[PDB]
Write an enzyme that holds these catalytic residues in place. Structure first.
Site, short mmCIF file in Angstrom:
data_model
loop_
_atom_site.label_atom_id
_atom_site.label_comp_id
_atom_site.label_asym_id
_atom_site.label_seq_id
_atom_site.Cartn_x
_atom_site.Cartn_y
_atom_site.Cartn_z
N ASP A 95 38.41 38.18 36.76
CA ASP A 95 37.84 36.92 36.71
C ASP A 95 36.31 37.02 36.11
O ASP A 95 35.35 37.60 36.97
CB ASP A 95 37.61 36.37 38.25
N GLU A 126 29.84 38.89 47.42
CA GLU A 126 30.85 38.12 46.92
C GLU A 126 31.63 37.68 48.23
O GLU A 126 32.45 38.55 48.50
CB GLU A 126 31.28 38.39 45.74
N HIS A 155 39.25 32.41 39.85
CA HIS A 155 40.32 32.74 40.84
C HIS A 155 40.54 31.93 42.03
O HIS A 155 41.93 31.82 42.77
CB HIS A 155 40.53 34.46 41.13
CA LIG Z 1 35.90 36.63 47.67
#
Ligand SMILES: [Ca+2]
Ligand SMILES: [Ca+2]
Ligand SMILES: [Ca+2]
Ligand SMILES: [Ca+2]
Ligand SMILES: [Ca+2]
Ligand SMILES: [Ca+2]
Ligand SMILES: [Ca+2]
Ligand SMILES: [Ca+2]
Ligand SMILES: [Ca+2]
Ligand SMILES: [Ca+2]
Ligand SMILES: [Ca+2]
Ligand SMILES: [Ca+2]
Lengths: 326, 326
Positions: free
Chosen positions: B18, B110, B269
């Site tokens: 991604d 993230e 994604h």
């Molecule tokens: Ca994640």
């Protein structure tokens, strides 16, 4: 109100949207108009009823559409909508115990599963032939053939090499992830359903079995294993990732109509059944590959497909790998 | 030997491939070079380690990469390969109980899940801020925003209308299958993760919450529900299928870098989180739609995302639908 028929709608959508599948059946049935017109038919695993209506439309006098799953109710609705409730009869439950008023002149069925025999209706078709088919009666399709070829799966190739390319895009080396991805993606014994193209085929495909569906002894052969040996020579230099298995079926001609699931032919929902080696093996032009493939029932479930692979690449030793569908 | 790390390799492959995701983080971290250089960082849910190496590469003095899943072992290997074992330290186990030698100047993560908060690491990030972040310390990304819009899902439209088109292709009417497909595809209460485009958006998207990650009271707000009201007016005539929810996150500027999962922006994604009504409702240009959306913990699992939707279309009555991830 809420329903849990999502998965159910999805699979029938998939089959019908498969124009290669569905148009092959439409045409294969009409090819046999001469032997159907005015005759009686049994549709085994009728699903939504579309194949039985095709039989009607080939002029069959009466069609018995037998279906054990919940979709049988939509099939009765569909039949009625096509003005055929007088001629096509929808009978719930498995064909093994359904009771018809008469024996039939023909059996039609789309019975094929992934790898041909995963969760297929073949055993049911053969039971019905024995119990309900008249002598001289016909089966549509009438035969199947199984094929194997070595593959260099270009998408798998890309996934494995991915980690070594991370440097080139984000400036962090992840080439050590490659051994790991290989273990994870190939280091298992599950049959993988995936669609390939000719760009993935590494040697001339080989037919390893031919099944005449009406032949004596087939029910027994299914129990003991369907398969055979194969030999081939590689086209060129590539990583061998394993083998692909696929099938075709043939309808009588009334030139036979062949429905194929080969990667060299138009795509179908059956895709192909892939058997990965534990890791890639380098091959070259004229590298010889031989082996044996056997399609088997699983021990706790005859309809869960097992595939036993024996193979020898070049002057490597013969090896064995025993696969099954999840 | 055999392994069951297929699914494991797959998700990390997906995140790294991604480029919108991964390049946003690379750039967002380097944007903060001034505040990182010579400083200490904690990476919460470090996965394969790529984000912690980015922090090193922004000149961070020391990075603690904490990861509870099995991939932590590949991360240590990757760190070593990048010559960073002296500076980036991989610590297994959950951040809630990991013990570091010092408090940190920055936390990077993230942490976002589907629908932002499905199986997200936000609670973990907030726990670590409280326990390990110095005062004046920074969080990357620093904020998130949530958006909703009404949708006409063109792919769903095609799936529902499929049955009425069967006549036109195979000469059998299956239009009765449509009510059934609607029940099956929309008559449930599951959040569907699916990627859309602007061709699916039926009114101007609305921001219904803004979360400053370092703000007092956020852990409590997550427990009670994050959300708000919205009002919009439809662009034109279409079947309303429901609503889409998506998010963005923002990195400090050191012009802020925004990572968006909007269907009007490049695909990621995360796709979007779709909330289908039980059946389509006709709307037109300037049809007004208002309602409220709330993201909630599920009763047996705070990390399973629940979404409570209240909505009113035109002069239809307000309705409620309570959704959850499978
Ligand atoms: Ca994640
Ligand atoms: Ca089938
Ligand atoms: Ca199954
Ligand atoms: Ca594919
Ligand atoms: Ca042969
Ligand atoms: Ca044989
Ligand atoms: Ca030779
Ligand atoms: Ca889950
Ligand atoms: Ca999609
Ligand atoms: Ca607002
Ligand atoms: Ca609010
Ligand atoms: Ca208005």
């Amino acid at each position: 109100l809420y329903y849990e028929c999502y998965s159910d709608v999805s699979v029938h959508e998939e089959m019908i949207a498969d124009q290669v599948r569905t148009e092959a059946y439409r045409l294969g049935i009409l090819k046999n108009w001469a032997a159907l017109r005015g005759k009686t038919v049994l549709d085994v695993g009728a699903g939504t009823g579309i194949l039985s209506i095709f039989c009607a439309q080939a002029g069959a006098r009466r069609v018995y559409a037998v279906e054990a799953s919940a979709i049988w109710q939509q099939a009765r609705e569909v039949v009625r909508l096509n003005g055929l409730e007088d001629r096509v009869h929808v009978l719930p439950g498995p064909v093994e115990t359904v009771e018809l008023p008469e024996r039939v002149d023909a059996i039609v069925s789309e019975w094929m599963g992934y790898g041909l025999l995963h969760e297929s209706m073949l055993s049911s078709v053969l039971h019905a032939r024995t119990k309900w088919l008249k002598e001289g009666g016909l089966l549509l399709p009438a035969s199947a053939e199984l094929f194997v070829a070595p593959i260099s799966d270009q998408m798998l190739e890309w996934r494995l090499g991915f980690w070594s390319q991370v440097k080139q895009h984000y400036g962090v080396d992840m080439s050590c992830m490659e051994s790991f991805a290989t273990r994870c993606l190939m280091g298992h014994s599950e049959i993988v359903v995936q669609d390939l193209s000719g760009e993935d085929v590494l040697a001339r495909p080989q037919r390893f079995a031919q099944l005449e569906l009406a032949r004596a002894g087939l029910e027994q052969e299914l129990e003991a294993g369907v398969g055979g040996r194969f030999r081939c020579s590689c086209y060129g230099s590539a990583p061998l990732h394993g083998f692909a298995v696929w099938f075709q079926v043939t309808f009588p001609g009334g030139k036979p109509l062949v429905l194929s699931t080969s990667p060299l032919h138009p795509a179908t929902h059956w895709k192909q059944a892939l058997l990965y080696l534990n890791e890639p093996v380098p091959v070259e032009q004229d590298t010889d590959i031989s082996g044996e493939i056997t399609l088997l029932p699983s021990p706790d479930n005859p309809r869960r497909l097992r595939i036993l692979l024996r193979y020898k690449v070049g002057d490597h030793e013969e090896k064995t790998k025993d696969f099954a569908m999840e």
